[PDB]
A paper describes a structure:
[name] has two ordered domains, a [name] at the N-terminus and an RRM-containing RNA-binding region closer to the C-terminus. In contrast to this widely accepted paradigm, we demonstrate that the fission yeast [name]-RRM protein [name] drives transcription termination of both types of Pol II transcribed genes. Using a multidisciplinary approach, our study demonstrates that conserved [name]-RRM proteins play a key role in 3′ end formation of Pol II transcripts. We present high-resolution structures of the [name] and RRM domain of [name].
Thus, we crystallized the [name]-CID1–152 and compared the structure with other [name] structures in complex with [name] peptides to determine whether interacting aa are topologically conserved. The highest affinity was observed to S2P, followed by S5P, S7P and unphosphorylated peptide. Also, several aa make phosphate-independent contacts with the [name]. Most notably, a Tyr (Y64 in [name]) forms an aromatic (π–π) interaction with Y1 of the [name] in all published [name]-[name] structures (Y62 in Fig. 2e and Y67 in Fig. 2f) and a conserved Asp was shown to be important for Nrd1 function. When these two residues are mutated to Ala, binding to S2P-[name] can still be observed (lanes 7 and 9) suggesting that both aa may contribute to the S2P interaction. Y64 and D67 were predicted to be involved in phosphorylation-independent interactions and to therefore affect binding to all types of [name]. Indeed, Y64K reduces binding to all phosphorylated and unphosphorylated peptides; however, it has a stronger effect on S2P than S5P interaction (lane 4 and Fig. 2g–i). Despite [name] having its highest affinity to S2P-[name], this demonstrates that disrupting interactions with S2P-[name] alone is not sufficient to observe the full phenotype, and that interactions with S5P-[name] are also required for proper functioning of [name].
Residue numbers in the entry: 2 to 153
Write the structure that this text describes.
């Protein structure tokens, strides 16, 4: 459908108690896959939501990022598109842009999220490793930062 609907769902999630919604994650993912030429708008809207969201909501924003990045990656494989040489207006472009904001969103969640949410981000690294979503060097950096943040 569109970016206006996507931003409207993010607005509703911002006002929710937990920021975690399986139904909203699926709706947001469909809107981004139905509008791939506008992937810069959808990726930028997730970045803006994650950064402004309450501290309790950073994990839910990472679940949105997770679903969207893996869906662009699936689309790219289907269309024989490379992550190393992405088509900006197509699935590989979206996969590349979502990768570009991942470090910032994980770092922001490390700084603000309740400590209980931090092992849940380690679980995303495992999902990404299994799906080969991000290069191992990126995943090692994220894992190291999360392990450091979990204190002891």
């Amino acid at each position: 459908s569109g970016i206006a609907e996507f931003d409207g769902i993010l607005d509703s999630l911002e006002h929710s108690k937990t920021g975690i919604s399986g139904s909203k994650i699926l709706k947001l993912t469909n809107l981004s896959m139905e509008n791939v030429s506008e992937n810069a708008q959808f990726v930028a809207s997730v970045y803006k939501y994650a950064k402004r969201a309450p501290v309790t909501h950073k994990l839910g924003a990472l679940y949105i990022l997770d679903s969207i990045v893996r869906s662009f990656q699936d689309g790219a494989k289907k269309n024989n598109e490379s992550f190393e040489n992405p088509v900006d207006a197509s699935f590989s472009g979206g996969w590349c842009k979502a990768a570009e904001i991942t470090d910032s969103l994980v770092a922001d969640a490390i700084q603000h999220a309740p400590s209980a949410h931090l092992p849940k981000i380690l679980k995303l690294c495992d999902i990404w490793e299994k799906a080969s979503t991000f290069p191992p060097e990126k995943l090692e950096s994220l894992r190291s930062k999360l392990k450091d943040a979990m204190a002891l």
